[PDB]
Amino acid sequence: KAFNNFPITNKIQCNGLFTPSNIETLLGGTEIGKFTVTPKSSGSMFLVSADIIASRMEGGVVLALVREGDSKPCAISYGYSSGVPNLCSLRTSITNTGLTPTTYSLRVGGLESGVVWVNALSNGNDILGITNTSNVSFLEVIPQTNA
Amino acid sequence: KAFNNFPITNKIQCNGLFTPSNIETLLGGTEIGKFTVTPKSSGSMFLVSADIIASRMEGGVVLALVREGDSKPCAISYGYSSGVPNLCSLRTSITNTGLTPTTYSLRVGGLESGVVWVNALSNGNDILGITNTSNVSFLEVIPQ
Amino acid sequence: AFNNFPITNKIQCNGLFTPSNIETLLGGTEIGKFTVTPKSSGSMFLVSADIIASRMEGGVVLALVREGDSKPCAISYGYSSGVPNLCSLRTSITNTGLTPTTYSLRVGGLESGVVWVNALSNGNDILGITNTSNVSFLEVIPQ
Ligand SMILES: [K+]
């Protein structure tokens, strides 16, 4: 079937917040990447893993995956930073509805308040003075029919 | 080769602690899911990933995977929450014996003290006012 | 091909990661070495390191080094408040042949601080038992 990895090496200032008002809309957080994938197989799943290096002053990080054409996220996850960079992750298994190429958008933002930096320290400076890499991968798998 | 994903969306208050006296028993934590998988290949392994949204007042979260029929966990992992929700994960490779369906239970609880809420804020409220989703997946693979 | 490499020892990771050593081989403490051989050409390895780590309040750094290189090919970040927490590295590396290749995983403090792997910050067993961190290599064919 399919495997696709999408590295994200850009630094992103995510000043877009996630709130109870915007969480089920398209307005929450800040987009950090877009990814187009095509299932090879009927009846398959995409196992999606976003593993994002992020910093913020003490608080929560929200990640939201949006299928282009939908009006709200199809998966939402949560991370944390104390001030120092931490891996913030989203895992989901999406049931595929055909063989049409589909574009997903990943958005990142503070839980209710605060600015989140992706691939940087909490002030936007390079972590350890270098370029860092976050990753979003899509792995197509066939789920087992359980007897 | 078998694959299955098991979403978990209930808000669950995990009052069961993990302690040095219960960690090698079936009594630690609070069960948050139970899953039955069937290997298609003999001598395979399951790559298991539990990714659980959890909150607790400042402290450690423990995750334990228990194979039904065993007397203690076959895998143990650790997570953290400051009070705000955070993903707490267990990732392991588990050996399969034969082709019969096998049932696994996932337990979550505080490291030695504290209450852990799964899929909720530390007071049991909905995170961002919505239903939230945790996942446990099993991917069958042939080891080298 | 799938290969899993469990790491069970209690390891004091006293080697720091600093701006001066991050792009060298000198950062961190090696916690494991893994030799894998791609079965298919054009393939990638999906690498997942999930390491139980503790330190006094602060950042944990993880670096994967491929034998022959002068610096890490993947770097990730974790956190501990003083109690053990899973610190992870995820990456996809492109395979270049069908010959065995050796990788090294190093863990250390972000700029300062001792990190313990598979242990409390004083080197005691967590919950009084042996604990397990894992590094796996799953060979897959890309698009
Ligand atoms: K903290």
The CA B102 to ligand 1 mean position distance, Å, reads 38
Asked if A45 contacts A97 with a C-beta cutoff of 8 angstroms, the reply is no
Is the Cβ–Cβ distance between B32 and B14 less than 8 Å?
yes
Residue from C51, C59, C54, C3 nearest C30 by CA: C51
Contacts of A89 in chain C (CB under 8 A): 88
3-state secondary structure of B50: strand
Q: Which chains touch B (3 or more CB pairs under 8 A)?
A: A, C
What residues pair up with A48 in beta bridges, in sequence order? A92, A138
DSSP string, C36-70: E--SSTT-EEEEEEEEEEE-SSEEEEEEEEETT-S
C78 touches chain A (CB under 8 A): yes
- How far is ligand 1, taken at its centre, from the CA of residue B79, in Å? 12
Residue in the block written with tokens 């096998």:
B102
From the CA of C75, how many Å to the nearest CA of chain A?
7
Alpha carbons within 13 angstroms on the beta-carbon side of residue C98 total 4
Please state whether beta strands B59-67 and B102-110 pair in parallel, antiparallel, or not at all (unpaired): antiparallel
Contact residues on chain C for A80, CB-CB shorter than 8 A: 79
Cβ pair A23:B84 closer than 8 A: no
The verdict on C61 touching A (C-beta cutoff 8 Å) is: yes
Contact B3 A62 (CB under 8 A): no
Chains in contact with A, where contact means 3 or more Cβ–Cβ distances below 8 Å, are B, C
CB distance A93–B53 less than 8 Å?
no
Question: Could you write out the DSSP letters of every residue in B2-37?
Answer: -EEEEEE-S-EEE---B-TTTTTSS-SSEEEEEEEE
**Are C1 and C19 spatial neighbours (Cβ–Cβ below 8 Å)?**
no
Please indicate if any CB of chain C lies within 8 Å of the CB of B74: no
Report d(CA B68, CA A115) in Å as an integer.
Answer: 45
Q: Say if CB A96 and CB A57 are below 8 A apart.
A: no
Which residues, numbered 4 to 23 in chain B, qualify as contacts with chain C under a Cβ-Cβ cut-off of 8 Å? 18-20, 23
Q: What is the DSSP string of A69-104?
A: TBSS-SEEEEEEESSS-EEEEEEEEEEP-SSS-EEE
Nearest chain B residue to A82 by CA distance is: B82
On whether the CB atoms of residues B105 and B68 are closer than 8 A, the answer is: yes
Boundaries of domain holding A73: 1-147
- The span from the CA of A141 to the CA of C106, in Å, is 31
B93 in Cβ contact with B53 (< 8 Å): no
Q: How many CB atoms lie within 10 A of CB B1?
A: 14
**Do C55 and C109 touch, CB atoms closer than 8 A?**
yes
Q: Do B86 and A93 make contact, defined as CB atoms within 8 angstroms? A: no
| Token duo for residue B81 | 């929450």
- What kind of experiment solved this structure? X-ray
Label residue A27 exposed, middle or buried (CB < 10 Å: 0-12, 13-18, 19+).
Answer: middle
Cβ contact A88:A12 at 8 Å = no
A3 with C142: Cβ contact below 8 A: yes
Q: Is B59 helix (H, G, I), strand (E, B) or coil?
A: strand
In whole angstroms, give the CA distance from residue C86 to residue B40. 30
Nearest CA in chain C to B89: C86
- Token reading at B80: 């953290």
Q: Which helix (H) or strand (E) holds B69?
A: none
Note whether B51 contacts A91, CB cutoff 8 Å.
yes
- Check if the beta carbon of residue A110 is closer than 8 Å to that of residue A65: no
- Cα A82 to middle of ligand 1, angstroms: 5
From the list C32, C79, C76, the residue with the least C-alpha distance to C54 is: C79
Which residue from C3, C44, B48, B53 is spatially nearest to A6, judged by alpha carbons? C44
CB B117 within 8 A of CB B8: no
**Chain mean position to CA C35:** 14
CA B142 to chain centre: 23
Structure tokens given for C84: 């053990």
Chain B's closest residue to A141, CA to CA, is: B3
Q: Is A39 helix (H, G, I), strand (E, B) or coil?
A: coil
Q: How far apart are CA C134 and CA C107, in angstroms?
A: 13
Domain total in chain A: 1
Identify each DSSP E strand in chain A by its residue range: 3-8, 12-14, 30-37, 45-55, 59-67, 75-81, 86-95, 102-110, 116-118, 134-141
Q: How far apart are CA C43 and CA B34, in angstroms?
A: 35
Q: What angle do CA B105, B111, B112 make, to 5 degrees?
A: 115
- CATH value at residue A107: 2.60.120.1340
Task: Name the minimum distance, in Å, from the CA of A129 to any CA of chain B.
Answer: 27
DSSP readout, C62-118? EEEEETT-SS-SEEEEEEESSS-EEEEEEEEEE---SS-EEEEEEEEEBSS--EEES
CA B32/CA A137 separation, integer angstroms: 27
d(CA A111, CA C51): 26
Nearest 5°: the CA angle A66, A69, A74 is 30
List, as one string, the DSSP characters of B88-108. EEEEEEEE--SSS-EEEEEEE
The amino acid present at A58, given as its one-letter code, is: E
Q: In angstroms, how far apart are the furthest CA atoms of chain B?
A: 46
- Give the mutation candidate from A41, A80, A94 for the B interface (greatest B CB count, under 10 A): A80
Name the DSSP class of C124.
P
Size (chain C), residues: 143
